[PDB]
Amino acid sequence: SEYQDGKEFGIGDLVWGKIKGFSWWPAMVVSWKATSKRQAMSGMRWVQWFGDGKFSEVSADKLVALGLFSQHFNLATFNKLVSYRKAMYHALEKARVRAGKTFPSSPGDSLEDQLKPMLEWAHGGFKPTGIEGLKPN
Amino acid sequence: DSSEYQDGKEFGIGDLVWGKIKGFSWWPAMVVSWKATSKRQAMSGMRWVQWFGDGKFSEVSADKLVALGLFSQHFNLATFNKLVSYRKAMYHALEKARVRAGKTFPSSLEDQLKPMLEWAHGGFKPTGIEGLKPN
Ligand SMILES: CCCN(CCO)CCCCCO
Ligand SMILES: CCCN(CCO)CCCCCO
């Protein structure tokens, strides 16, 4: 029922979302019931931002699939803000689990170290699954 | 309405669970509110848990949690024999279970642990897993 408005994106979808004064940031579409807030208005979606876990209401027409990765990733913000690197880690970890992807680990690799192969995977088109692997189920 | 962890998946605040992190055996924990953690709200489909034995907090997928009551299935005998840290975790977890279930034993950590472990492995009789519920 919720979000059945003929527009894009449903509960669980991984997305980039854009707030004024902010880069595109990774998020997951959620039900209004998870937010402790209120039902969304027409054509809007509740999203939860990776990294800080906060909830925002955003137009379905203003979200893009996380799978358009290199297009929306912002290297300048990544190098400038630890909060963006953490967001990218949590977003890509969710993507990895969904795709059944694995990466060679080694304690105690830092944040940047863990991110390196995840970012290469994302920039490379999420092989072998492709973006189909990012879908919820 | 709308509230913490109302995402349609299993597990609520206070639930005793086993949690699985890559690189670790299934480990006992309690589901906690994000407010207990000094961190941030958990992503939809995930829960904050506090691990027995070390008191640390982790954000864990509900798909990587199971009820502590499924004890024999998730208890790792190899890990128990190998790691003092896991035996310590078993003690604190099963002591919480014992108090919730209103269970008493005849009364050392290892000596204390023995009948608690027998009880858990045997299915938490007489209450069964219903006895482990919070409140
Ligand atoms: C849409 C932009 C993402 N926000 C989420 C908060 O609602 C986080 C920004 C933190 C930047 C400070 O380091
Ligand atoms: C998955 C279990 C979580 N704790 C660590 C908390 O982050 C494990 C304790 C290590 C035992 C080393 O002897």
What is the largest distance, in Å, between two alpha-carbon atoms of chain A? 47
Task: Examine residue B134 and say whether the peptide bond preceding it is cis (omega within 30 degrees of 0).
Answer: no
- Reference A93, options B60, B4, B11; nearest CA is B60
Residue showing tokens 């086993």? B18
Q: What is the CATH code for A1-66?
A: 2.30.30.140
Structure tokens at B19: 């949690």
Structure tokens at B77: 């005998």
Q: Distance (Å, rounded) from C-alpha A133 to C-alpha B55? A: 35
Q: What are phi and psi of B29, to 5 degrees?
A: -155, 170
Q: Of the candidates A36, A38, A55, which has its C-beta nearest B3's C-beta?
A: A36
Contact B71, B80 (CB under 8 A): no
Q: Distance (Å, rounded) from C-alpha A56 to C-alpha A37? A: 9
List the single residue in B with minimal CA-CA distance to A27: B43
- Reference A67, options A8, A112, A7, A114; nearest CA is A8
Task: Name the CATH code of domain B69-133 (choices 2.40.37.10, 1.10.720.50, 3.40.50.2300, 3.60.15.10).
Answer: 1.10.720.50
Q: Distance (Å, rounded) from C-alpha A92 to C-alpha A87? A: 9
User: What resolution in angstrom units was achieved for this structure?
Assistant: 1.7
Contacts of B65 (CB under 8 A, 6+ apart): B10, B11, B17, B18, B19, B20, B31, B47, B49
Task: Find the helix packing angle between B84-101 and B109-121, rounded to 10°.
Answer: 60
Could you tell me the distance, in angstroms and rounded to a whole number, from the CA of residue B30 to the centre of ligand 2? 14
Interface of B with A (CB under 8 A): 1-8, 22-23, 34, 40-45, 61
Could you list the beta-strand ranges (E) of A34-134.
44-49, 55-59, 64-65
Q: What are phi and psi of B30, to 5 degrees?
A: -120, 135
**CB count, 10 Å around CB of A73?**
19
Could you tell me the distance, in angstroms and rounded to a whole number, from the CA of residue B7 to the centre of ligand 1? 23
A67-135: what fold? 1.10.720
The letter for the amino acid at A69 is F
Contact A111, A76 (CB under 8 A): no
Contact A12, A136 (CB under 8 A): yes
Q: Does the Cβ of B83 fall within 6 Å of ligand 2? A: yes
CA A133, chain centre distance (Å): 13
Residue showing tokens 């035996």? B87
Q: Distance (Å, rounded) from C-alpha A98 to C-alpha A133? A: 6
Contact A117, A127 (CB under 8 A): no
Extents of the domains making up chain A: 1-66, 67-135
The letter for the amino acid at B90 is M
Q: What are phi and psi of A103, to 5 degrees?
A: -130, 140
Q: Of the candidates B8, B22, B43, which has its C-beta nearest A48's C-beta?
A: B43
Q: Distance (Å, rounded) from C-alpha B24 to C-alpha B79? A: 9
B1-68: what fold? SH3 type barrels. (2.30.30)
Task: Give the three-state DSSP class for B73.
Answer: helix
Q: What are phi and psi of A80, to 5 degrees?
A: -90, -35
Contacts 24+ apart (CB under 8 A), A88-92: A88/A26, A88/A50, A88/A51, A88/A115, A88/A118, A88/A119, A89/A51, A89/A114, A89/A115, A89/A118, A90/A26, A90/A50, A90/A51, A90/B43, A91/A14, A91/A26, A91/A27, A91/A50, A91/A51, A91/A66, A92/A118, A92/A119, A92/A121, A92/A122
Q: Distance (Å, rounded) from C-alpha A96 to C-alpha A114? A: 12
> Residue A50 half-sphere exposure, CB side, CA atoms within 13 Å?
25
